[PDB]
Amino acid sequence: QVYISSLALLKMLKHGRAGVPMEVMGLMLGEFVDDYTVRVIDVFAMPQSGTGVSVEAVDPVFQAKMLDMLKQTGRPEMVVGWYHSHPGFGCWLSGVDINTQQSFEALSERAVAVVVDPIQSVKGKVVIDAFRLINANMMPRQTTSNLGHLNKPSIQALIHGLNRHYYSITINYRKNELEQKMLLLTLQDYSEHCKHNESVVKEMLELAKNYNKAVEEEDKMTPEQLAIKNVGKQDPKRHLEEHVDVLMTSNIVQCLAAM
Amino acid sequence: VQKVVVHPLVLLSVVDHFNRIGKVGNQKRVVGVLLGSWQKKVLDVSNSFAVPFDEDDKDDSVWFLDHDYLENMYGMFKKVNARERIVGWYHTGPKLHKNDIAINELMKRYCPNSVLHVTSEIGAEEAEEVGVEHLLRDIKDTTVGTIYQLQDVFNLLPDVSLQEFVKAFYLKTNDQMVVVYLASLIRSVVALHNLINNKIANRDAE
Amino acid sequence: YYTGRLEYSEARRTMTNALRKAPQHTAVGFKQTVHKLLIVVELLLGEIPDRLQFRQPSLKRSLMPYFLLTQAVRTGNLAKFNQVLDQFGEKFQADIIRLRHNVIKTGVRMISLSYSRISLSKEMIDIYSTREPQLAFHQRISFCLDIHNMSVKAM
């Protein structure tokens, strides 16, 4: 349903992550065709107060004047709606609703905002969700059976009690091949080759002595998964595997390119 | 003086900007300024306007402005974030000429370092790669899951002189080969330990 | 092993493939001559002391003649290798220049008194090395581990 250019996603994460928690805000720009398919191309970072920002961020001269400026040498069409930048927890909007819900119909019903999370999303899967005006009207969309993943939110009572008003739908994504593609020696005996095969073979010596002690010891009188893998005195044997792995990616490969 | 780092924030911004100006005609060196922290190695982290580029179509001897518009977006992003200073400016790929060095010089106003050349490094995207690693789906990063100068070029080429160097090269290879032989052994042993673990496991599951 | 029953390039890899299946098999015929015959051929290529005599007490299967010819080459003179050959004469496996080859590996020094005596590019003599000389042996064990993977394909 709701679409994004994902430049709005990166400027979104930029403005959010830059200003935590401070709940930074802004408002994006796009176009409407039907019920709720909203292409969002650019988010507009409206400025920050001291520590608590509200409807006062809806300024005359900043969004009006700069909407004229990047209307001229940039994004031409009308705005969509706002956003909000929840740090930490996730998505529920208690004091946010009185500062956001009444603002929409001043413009249009074709107006969404979105709460994001640049703290708990360290991921490559960032928490994004728009919503509705279900302040009132408890009075269609076959969806293939209610869309799936909003019968799986973090089902928490204050969140789901917020979801009575909220009703998120989807977040689509676009990108192009160009952008995709874009994003996608030596050292020899300085001291290097010696002093990382003079090092690691010594831990292979006495760590293989402790591997000897491990195989001698656990051979008999062993039960219950070696007392839960020796959480204590970690860790024999695997250490040897790791050591073996470290040199054979190094003492060959760039040495190979030496040839 | 250090090099440049990168943030693909400005890369997606300029790429979307040439998705903007790509109407009928107008293959244009669209110059827009950057704002961000400038110090030792940086990127000038965020883009700006352009005052879009048109000369005649190729007669590139006439300019774009305002300096008050420089401090429109650069001035009123200070109301949003105050960490920034202009150095960076871009244009299209890949051709440059005296127009571009004349906007380095003529429209200078700070810009000591701004190549979009020794400052040549295309960065890491610190602390905001969450908006990159979500944007690195189908086909993935690797796959994830998988005359004077040229006169001085060949001054440092010739080496077949194997007496000394050859012997040395032979030797090092031998020593490192040995290391690998030593290793490729203890992982074979611990692999065999996993074999007897699996065989006694399924042997007891009989 | 029956393929092991001329060339010497692969008799030892078919000796490794041969000396596998005999926990307790026979007392004549199949179990006996594979080991002692194949290590005799392993001296027909020329492999001397340090796998020979302490590996003997596993079999001890009548154990006179072939071991006697192994030390008759380990010393390497025709004078008492004669009585290993002619005085025994029934040892069988009938199918001389190799025990000549052992003593002349030494020389007196190198040339041996202006190219003439009897006993009876890496300027070093062949010690070790860090180039092509030792590389061959190196890639031996690497190959072994790679061939030992087969282990992971068995559960």
Partner: peptide
């Protein structure tokens, strides 16, 4: 030995 130089 670049041809000669299974581990993965």
């Amino acid at each position: 030995q670049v041809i000669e130089y299974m581990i993965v």
